[PDB]
């Protein structure tokens, strides 16, 4: 409940915009990670479910 | 002996190791402990040249050659006359040349200049490093490495290059190759600039660093500066030796195939039409 | 009680870190090794 | 070419050829152009084992 | 040396192309498969598609034979299937004058 | 700077983002990398001149 | 106590619309995993 | 750690310096339109100054152009005018030479015609910027070396594309205009004559070309050294030596025994560059017309190493024991 | 709710031009994601589908 | 009251109300056009 | 366990940064390498599970 | 330039109170995974 | 025995940052060098027991 | 003997960080050096008896 | 309020010719579409 004191440490606008670009980029990671696999990718299963 | 000016710079201090107990000028040399080990390891690896050339049976120059060994010997010790030799001499060659990187540290300490000397230096050794050790290293066998041959080490260069059937396409080479002839560019220039500002026409005042900055304005458009083209001439070279080290650990170890059949990712890009 | 003269505490860490560093390679390079090996064959 | 082998030889090397060449119908018919591609290039083949 | 999968130094001393002393033993082979080839492609290959290969089988530019070359049975490899036995238990298509079994 | 740099980063981590990206649907590490270089350059360039 | 400038209070009004923004990320973040679950597990 | 002089830390920016002057009036053909560059002003200088643009500059410019064109519009007329296959082909498509049936007589325009059109204007388009280069230095009053150290790079221009081919006696022997091609020229011309290698001017050259890269990181490192005492101000420590030029002197006497001045570096680094592509020039003016064949030349002048190991494969390995089975 | 203070950190000309680039290249790349699979490739389907 | 880019308390407020409306209508254009795209191929 | 007075010593902003850094890299280390496991790969271990 | 005795007594506290949150999730994350698929 | 005399010359400031950089290569190094054992690599070993 | 003054010679700070420095690397070494033979690898060694 | 020192009603006086000439732009791209779909439909 004492974590506010974070933004004391750190400036509000670098650390914004790092955890803006990290998000996005450890979210797209994700997404590609599961498309790699045969299993957890939707585009081919559509596929295959369609046939 | 000393110069006109030399007597106020040789001051006690700046070494790195061994203290006063090494720290004196031998003629013009300065010796310290790594003037010591230089001298050490350049001597024993220069004699060792001529005892492998004089049991090869030939002293001519252009002739000799001190040959690594077979690559059946993999990374042990071979026999000395059966490329041990080779490998010693890289030992002491390697000991000398860093020992001639850290002597000219204490050197430019003692002077209390920068660094910039001792570190382009190591991008040589680097260079040299990574051709004698690192890619012999990589490729499993000592035998990778270049022979100690005026002309021998000529015949590696070209049978290492036709190794990956036409070595120009090599991309690292091109970006290597560009660096030499532009660091030759900027070389012929950069001298002329200076020579020409220095030595007017016979009869005319000597210009200053305004001159040749609008003269190069006057003809490229564009001029870098007196500063800037020590310090791009610095990177232009650097960038020469690193990348001249770059395209020859990733000609066996990273790519085997040939350099050519590379440029088939840019040909057969899905973007280009049948 | 405590110091407070100044001290350049990373200083040692660093070194220590590269020296480490040259180590923990090694003996990656000697427990797995040569993850490319690309083995040659003498023709001359 | 070939008629001089054994029964079970032909049938040996005609099979084979089949799957060498992946033609299922090869030297069936006779006056089919593979078949006729094939037996000049049955003798060529001879020829690089014994010639060359 | 994409046809063999090896380089140049494989049959040749970079420094010195033409001279046979500096040629390995498989500069020898390469210089009889020149030969093979050619014998191949002018008096084996290129008779028999000129009169049997249908239009569909014909090169694009010049409606030609298909020949073949060094690729053809190495494929990327220094020998053909990198070497092995295919004609020991194939005498048929290893002579001209009858299979010998023996 | 702390402006230029940090698009200069932002490019860079979306031409990895785009080379990962383009192996996944297919295409090859290089053919890859080098739209990943491109992106670098072109959105790196433009983000470089369009924010400062 | 401070090291970017921003005084005690502001930090507090800045860190409840942050953990609010973090809340609301996370809160559809589960509801996309847990349809994600249902259309396809990974357990 | 202390401030490599690599990237200026902050930059200043006042009135675009439009050049000096003096009675040759060199600001009648400047072109008095300055734009300063804050990327390239962290390495260099950040002004793009104005340039001079004479008659040599002129020509030279639009020769050149038609030169670049000519082989452009051969290049794209050569994938039939398509543009992705232009582009995708950009490397390997080039403006090949005349095919050596003709000899030195002007070849039809598609088998190198238009290659002999094309480098008349790049030879007309080159010497022009020679002249530009020596009518600037005349007209800013200094000494000619950005004209001579030029007229050592056309040397080599010259002897590769009009000297050689006119001495071998065919236009075949020029180098045609491709970014691969001339490369595949350069590995051809190795081949066909031998081994480049053994040329004595070929590893002359390279010395040259060694010593020019060697020199200028050294250079380019010592002055950087020394900037610190204002060693970047060369000009001034030529006519008034200052600690710059003592301690930059002091520490290559004391590393290898003798040392340079602030402008006797500039001899040695102007002669080491100079000297490349004139002993390349001499190198290439001799094979052909000359030799033929170099490491037969080095084999008859007794410095092509000899070799007593075997050469086949199967002399250190076996095929079965390369494949590991 | 009060999410209007991220003006106060954030530039709105900066933040702007960026928030452009990126939902462009976001959109183009996952057009050109759509066109590699082989399922939800308009293009091809329509040559597929006019038989 | 910190404001980093100049930017008042009502300045702000107005900013988001204007990027909230160039949010949404974003956003409903993208929801129609994914509701099209799942009629002609679901892809889930 | 107090052991409060190491902070004394530390610069909250750089070892917040470099602890944060190490964090994600340590996590993200032991994600990839029980991945490359063929048997705690939960992406092929689910696609072998349905099937 | 360093910080004070009470400045570090509640960075400190913080700090603890992040260590144990962060390690109660990951003691629960670790056992569901030793249910789940135990490594020992 | 009287070993408590080492700080009087080593700065406890320094040894505590460098001994812990040093511990967790030392960790991170045992612990690789046990996965590229085919006997302690414990991962392999769930895989064998499952089996 | 009299041994002790080589403290009177040597800094007892600048001895030690280059002896500790100096007994790991041996250490190191000399235990990669095991590894790198095969009668000397305990890892190997037990995978050995446990077959 | 301003950061490019341009009016308010100066702003929705460029707006309103804009958004005129982006509708235009659009309303040439609906018939040119429309055109292309009955030429060569891609649904
Ligand atoms: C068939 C031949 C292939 C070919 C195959 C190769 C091969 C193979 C190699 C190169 C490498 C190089 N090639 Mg190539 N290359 C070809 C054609 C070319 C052409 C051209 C115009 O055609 C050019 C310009 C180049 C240019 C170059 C540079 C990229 C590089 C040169 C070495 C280097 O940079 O120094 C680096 C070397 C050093 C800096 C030496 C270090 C010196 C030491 C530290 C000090 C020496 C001290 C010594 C003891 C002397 C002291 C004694 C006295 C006391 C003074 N190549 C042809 C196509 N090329 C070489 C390379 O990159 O090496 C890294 C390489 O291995
Ligand atoms: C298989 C390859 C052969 C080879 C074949 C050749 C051939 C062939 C040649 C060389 C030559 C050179 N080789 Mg060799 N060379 C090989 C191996 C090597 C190796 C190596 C490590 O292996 C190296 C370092 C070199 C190095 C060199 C240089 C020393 C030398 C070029 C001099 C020069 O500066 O050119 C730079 C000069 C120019 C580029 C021409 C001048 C350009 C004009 C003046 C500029 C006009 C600009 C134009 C208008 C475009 C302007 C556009 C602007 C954008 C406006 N070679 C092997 C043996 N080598 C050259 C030589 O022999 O020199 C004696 C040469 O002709
Ligand atoms: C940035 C990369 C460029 C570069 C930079 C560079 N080189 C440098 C420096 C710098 C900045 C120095 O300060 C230093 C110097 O003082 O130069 C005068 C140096 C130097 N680089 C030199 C030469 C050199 N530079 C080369 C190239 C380059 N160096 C690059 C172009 C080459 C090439 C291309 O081959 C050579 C040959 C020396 C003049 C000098 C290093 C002097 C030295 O090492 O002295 C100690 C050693 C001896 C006196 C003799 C040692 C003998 C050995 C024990 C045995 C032989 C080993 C060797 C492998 C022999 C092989 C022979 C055959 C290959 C023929
Ligand atoms: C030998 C030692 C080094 C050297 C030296 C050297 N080169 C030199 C000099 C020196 C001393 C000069 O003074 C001179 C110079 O001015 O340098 C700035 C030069 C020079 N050598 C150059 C480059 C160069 N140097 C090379 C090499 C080297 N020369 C070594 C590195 C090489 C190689 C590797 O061969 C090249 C290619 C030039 C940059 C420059 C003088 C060339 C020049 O300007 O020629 C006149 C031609 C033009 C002005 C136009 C050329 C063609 C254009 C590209 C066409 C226009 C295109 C555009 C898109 C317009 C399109 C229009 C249409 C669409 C209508
Ligand atoms: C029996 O036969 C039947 C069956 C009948 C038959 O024949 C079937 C034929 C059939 C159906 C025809 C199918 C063809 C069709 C439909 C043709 C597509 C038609 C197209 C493509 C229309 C082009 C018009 C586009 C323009 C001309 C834009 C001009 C763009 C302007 C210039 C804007 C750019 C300028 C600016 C300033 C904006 C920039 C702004 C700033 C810089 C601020
Ligand atoms: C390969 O291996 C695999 C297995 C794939 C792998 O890697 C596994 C993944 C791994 C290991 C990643 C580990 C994940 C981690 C660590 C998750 C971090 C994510 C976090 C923490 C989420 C933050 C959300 C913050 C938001 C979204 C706030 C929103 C903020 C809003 C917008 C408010 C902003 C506005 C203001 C504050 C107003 C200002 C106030 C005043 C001015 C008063
Ligand atoms: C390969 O793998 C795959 C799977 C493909 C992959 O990677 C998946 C990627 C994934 C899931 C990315 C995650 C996407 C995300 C997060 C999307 C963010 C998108 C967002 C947030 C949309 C904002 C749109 C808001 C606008 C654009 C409003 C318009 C604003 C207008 C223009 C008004 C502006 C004007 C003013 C304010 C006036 C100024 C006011 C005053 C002066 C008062
Ligand atoms: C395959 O490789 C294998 C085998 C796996 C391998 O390598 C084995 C791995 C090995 C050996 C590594 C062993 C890992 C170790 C040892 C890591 C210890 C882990 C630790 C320590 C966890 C820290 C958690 C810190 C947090 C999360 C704090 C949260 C607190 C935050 C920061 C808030 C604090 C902020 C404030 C209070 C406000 C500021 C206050 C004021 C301004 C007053
Ligand atoms: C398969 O997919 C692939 C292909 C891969 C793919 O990438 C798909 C493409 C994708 C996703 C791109 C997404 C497209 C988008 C987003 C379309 C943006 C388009 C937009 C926004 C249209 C603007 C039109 C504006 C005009 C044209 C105004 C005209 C302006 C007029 C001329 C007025 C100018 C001003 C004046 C005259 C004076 C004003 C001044 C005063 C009054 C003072
Ligand atoms: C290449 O060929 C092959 C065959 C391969 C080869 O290998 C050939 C090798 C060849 C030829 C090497 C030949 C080796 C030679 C010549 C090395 C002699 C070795 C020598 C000389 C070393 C003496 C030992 C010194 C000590 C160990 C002192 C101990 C000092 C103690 C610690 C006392 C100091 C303590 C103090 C307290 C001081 C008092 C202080 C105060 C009173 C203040
Ligand atoms: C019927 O069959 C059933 C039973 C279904 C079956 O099949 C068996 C399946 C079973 C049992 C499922 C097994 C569950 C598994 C494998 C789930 C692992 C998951 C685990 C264990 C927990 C993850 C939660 C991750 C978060 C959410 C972390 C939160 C951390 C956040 C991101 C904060 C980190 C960041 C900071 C603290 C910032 C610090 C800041 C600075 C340092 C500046
Ligand atoms: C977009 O725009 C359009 C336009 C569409 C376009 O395509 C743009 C153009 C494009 C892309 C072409 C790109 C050009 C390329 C890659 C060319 C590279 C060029 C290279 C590598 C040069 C090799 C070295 C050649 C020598 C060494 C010459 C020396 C010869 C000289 C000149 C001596 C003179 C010779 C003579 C024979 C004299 C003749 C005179 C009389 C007979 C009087
Ligand atoms: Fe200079």
Redesign the pocket.
Same mark, same amino acid.
């Given at each position: 409940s004492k974590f506010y004191k974070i933004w004391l440490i750190f400036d509000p606008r670098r650390v914004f915009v790092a955890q803006g670009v990290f998000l996005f980029l450890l979210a797209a990671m994700i997404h590609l990670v599961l498309l790699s696999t045969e299993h957890f990718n939707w585009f081919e299963l559509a596929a295959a479910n369609a046939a | 002996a000393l110069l006109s000016f030399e007597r106020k710079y040789r001051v006690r201090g700046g070494t790195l190791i061994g203290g006063d107990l090494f720290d004196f000028w031998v003629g013009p040399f300065y010796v310290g402990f790594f003037g010591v080990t230089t001298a050490f390891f350049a001597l024993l690896g220069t004699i060792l040249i001529f005892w492998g050339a004089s049991q090869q049976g030939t002293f001519n120059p252009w002739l000799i050659n001190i040959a690594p060994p077979d690559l059946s010997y993999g990374l042990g010790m071979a026999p000395l006359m059966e490329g041990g030799l080779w490998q010693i001499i890289t030992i002491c060659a390697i000991g000398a040349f860093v020992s001639w990187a850290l002597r000219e540290v204490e050197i430019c300490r003692k002077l209390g200049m920068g660094y910039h000397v001792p570190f382009a230096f190591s991008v040589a050794i680097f260079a040299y490093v990574t051709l004698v050790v690192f890619r012999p290293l990589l490729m499993g066998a000592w035998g990778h490495g270049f022979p100690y041959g005026i002309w021998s080490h000529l015949d590696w260069?070209?049978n290492t290059?036709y190794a990956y059937l036409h070595?120009?396409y090599n991309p690292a080479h091109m970006i290597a190759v560009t660096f030499?002839?532009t660091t030759?560019l900027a070389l012929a220039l950069h001298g002329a600039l200076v020579l020409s500002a220095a030595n007017p026409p016979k009869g005319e005042e000597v210009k200053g660093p305004d001159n040749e900055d609008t003269f190069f304005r006057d003809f490229i458009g564009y001029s870098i500066g007196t500063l800037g083209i020590h310090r791009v001439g610095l990177l232009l070279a650097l960038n020469a030796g690193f990348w001249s080290a770059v395209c020859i650990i990733i000609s066996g170890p990273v790519w085997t195939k040939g350099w050519p059949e590379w440029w088939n990712w840019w040909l057969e890009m899905p973007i280009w039409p049948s | 009680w405590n110091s407070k003269n100044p001290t350049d505490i990373y200083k040692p860490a660093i070194v220590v870190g590269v020296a480490g560093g040259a180590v923990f390679a090694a003996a990656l390079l000697v427990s797995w090794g040569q993850p490319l090996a690309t083995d040659s064959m003498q023709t001359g | 070419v070939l008629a001089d082998l054994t029964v079970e030889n032909y049938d040996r090397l005609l099979a084979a050829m089949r799957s060498w060449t992946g033609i299922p119908d090869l030297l069936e018919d006779p006056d089919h152009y593979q078949s006729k591609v094939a037996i000049n290039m049955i003798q060529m083949n001879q020829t690089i084992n014994e010639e060359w | 040396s994409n046809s063999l999968g090896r380089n140049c130094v494989f049959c040749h001393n970079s420094r010195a192309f033409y001279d046979p002393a500096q040629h390995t033993p498989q500069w020898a082979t390469a210089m009889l498969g020149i030969s093979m080839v050619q014998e191949l492609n002018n008096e084996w290959i290129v008779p028999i598609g000129e009169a049997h290969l249908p239009p569909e089988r014909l090169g694009p530019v010049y409606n030609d034979v298909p020949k073949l070359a060094c690729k053809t049975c190495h494929k990327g490899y220094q020998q053909p299937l990198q070497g092995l036995n295919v004609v020991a238990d194939w005498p048929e298509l290893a002579t001209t004058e009858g299979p010998f079994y023996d | 700077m702390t402006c230029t740099i940090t698009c200069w980063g932002i490019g860079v981590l979306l031409g990895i983002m785009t080379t990962v990206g383009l192996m996944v649907v297919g295409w090859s590490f290089l053919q890859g990398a080098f739209m990943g270089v491109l992106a670098w350059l072109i959105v790196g360039g433009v983000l470089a001149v369009a924010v400062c | 106590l401070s090291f970017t400038g921003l005084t005690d209070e502001q930090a507090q009004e800045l860190h409840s619309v942050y953990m609010s923004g973090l809340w609301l990320f996370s809160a559809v973040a589960v509801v996309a995993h847990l349809a994600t679950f249902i259309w396809r597990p990974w357990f | 750690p202390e401030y490599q002089n690599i990237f200026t830390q902050v930059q200043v920016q006042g009135p675009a310096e439009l050049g000096v002057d003096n009675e040759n009036n060199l600001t009648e053909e400047r072109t008095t339109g300055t734009g300063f560059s804050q990327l390239i002003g962290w390495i260099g200088n950040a002004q793009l100054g104005p340039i001079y643009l004479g008659w040599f500059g002129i020509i030279s410019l639009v020769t050149?152009t038609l030169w670049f064109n000519i082989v452009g519009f051969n290049m794209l007329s050569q994938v039939g005018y398509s543009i992705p296959e232009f582009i995708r082909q950009l490397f390997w498509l080039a403006l090949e030479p005349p095919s050596p049936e003709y000899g030195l007589r002007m070849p039809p325009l598609d088998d190198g015609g238009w290659f002999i059109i094309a480098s008349f204007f790049?030879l007309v388009?080159?010497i022009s910027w020679w002249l530009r280069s020596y009518q600037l230095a005349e007209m800013h009053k200094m000494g000619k070396h950005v004209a001579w150290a $030029?007229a050592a790079? *056309?040397w080599? $221009?010259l002897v590769?594309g009009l000297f050689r081919p006119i001495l071998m006696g065919s236009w075949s022997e020029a180098v045609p205009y491709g970014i691969f091609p001339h490369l595949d020229?350069?590995?051809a011309?190795?081949?066909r004559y031998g081994?480049?290698?053994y040329?004595p $001017?070929?590893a002359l050259? *390279?010395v $040259?070309?060694?010593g020019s890269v060697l020199l200028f990181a050294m250079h380019g490192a010592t002055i950087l050294a020394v900037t610190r005492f204002g060693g970047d101000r060369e000009l001034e420590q030529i006519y008034d030596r200052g600690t710059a030029s003592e301690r930059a002197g002091l520490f290559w006497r004391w590393t290898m025994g003798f040392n340079a001045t602030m402008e006797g570096i500039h001899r040695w680094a102007w002669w080491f560059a100079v000297l490349?592509?004139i002993?390349?020039? *001499?190198?290439?003016l001799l094979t052909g017309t000359v030799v033929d064949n170099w490491f037969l030349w080095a084999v008859e002048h007794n410095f092509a190493p000899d070799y007593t190991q075997d050469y086949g494969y199967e002399a250190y390995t076996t095929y079965d024991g390369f494949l590991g089975r």
């Open positions: - | 260069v070209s290059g070595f120009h030499f002839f030759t | - | - | - | - | - | 050149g790049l388009s080159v $030029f790079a *056309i080599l $221009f590769l020229w350069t590995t011309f190795s081949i081994n480049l290698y040329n $001017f070929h050259s *390279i $040259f070309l060694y490349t592509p002993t390349g020039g *001499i190198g290439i």
